Amino acid sequence: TINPTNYTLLKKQAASLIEDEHHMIAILSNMSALLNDNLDQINWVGFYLLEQNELILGPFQGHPACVHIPIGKGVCGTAVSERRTQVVADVHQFKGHIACDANSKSEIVVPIFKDDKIIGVLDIDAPITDRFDDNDKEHLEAIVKIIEKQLA
Amino acid sequence: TINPTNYTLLKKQAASLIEDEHHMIAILSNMSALLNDNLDQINWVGFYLLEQNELILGPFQGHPACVHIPIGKGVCGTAVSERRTQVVADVHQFKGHIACDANSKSEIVVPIFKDDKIIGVLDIDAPITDRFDDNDKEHLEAIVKIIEKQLA
What we know:
2 copies of one chain form a homodimer. Chain A is an alpha+beta fold. Chain A has a single domain (1-152), classed as Beta-Lactamase (2-Layer Sandwich), CATH 3.30.450. Chain A is 34% helix and 28% strand. The first copy, chain A, contains 4 helices and 6 strands, in the order H-H-E-E-E-H-E-E-E-H. In chain A, a hairpin with a 2-residue loop joins strand 5 and strand 6. In chain A, helix 1 (7-16) runs parallel beside helix 4. Chain A is globular and about 40 Å long.
């Protein structure tokens, strides 16, 4: 069972942990908390930032994670190489998954852009398969857009 | 009731989420998770970094928090101005506590140094009073020393 999220109100809340703020790490840290507090059936939510051509672990809510993820590898790395959101129903069956993806049963990764350049990703993992659907995708991408506008 | 923490083994674990790593934010993010996973009776654990003469929110495990904390104000700000660890049994009775400290009943804040300069603090809040004692202080300061050596 997955309790629904009121994404409509969540987007307004997100605007508050983003508005008037210009310290990116602080924005990402608070956003990881906001999402964790409002998404049921997830075991990890956070960000990875693109640096020196590889994803580097950023703020998150959950257990310790891998720090380095190569572009094109893993669910997160594939989101960057594909330059599009990845909605994975079964990570174990995801072509390109890596050991670092081990504790994720299903997952959604949204690329974050700035000046047409991917600067990182929003990554949300779940302890069960098929956690995310098209609706979750639409609302989470909208929330990422709010983050992008603030970082722009 | 507060379940004890095996700080001896925790220090060795900390060395693993710090060793060979040079990305500070990644180190701090993973450390917040490690501490959260091994400390009972706490409701927030994370870091604030000193920037432009004020504390700025960094990686943490818990609910959204205030982004800006002035030096000398609040439990965290007082740790920086006093240049020493603050072990607070009752935040509500702490001289200088601020609205941003509202959800913390007891707390411990350890300053983090680099080249004799305070670069931030480790902040751990609890939902009950008198959560931390001298023993917690000794072990947490030792863990901060491990972080300092890696960032040095």
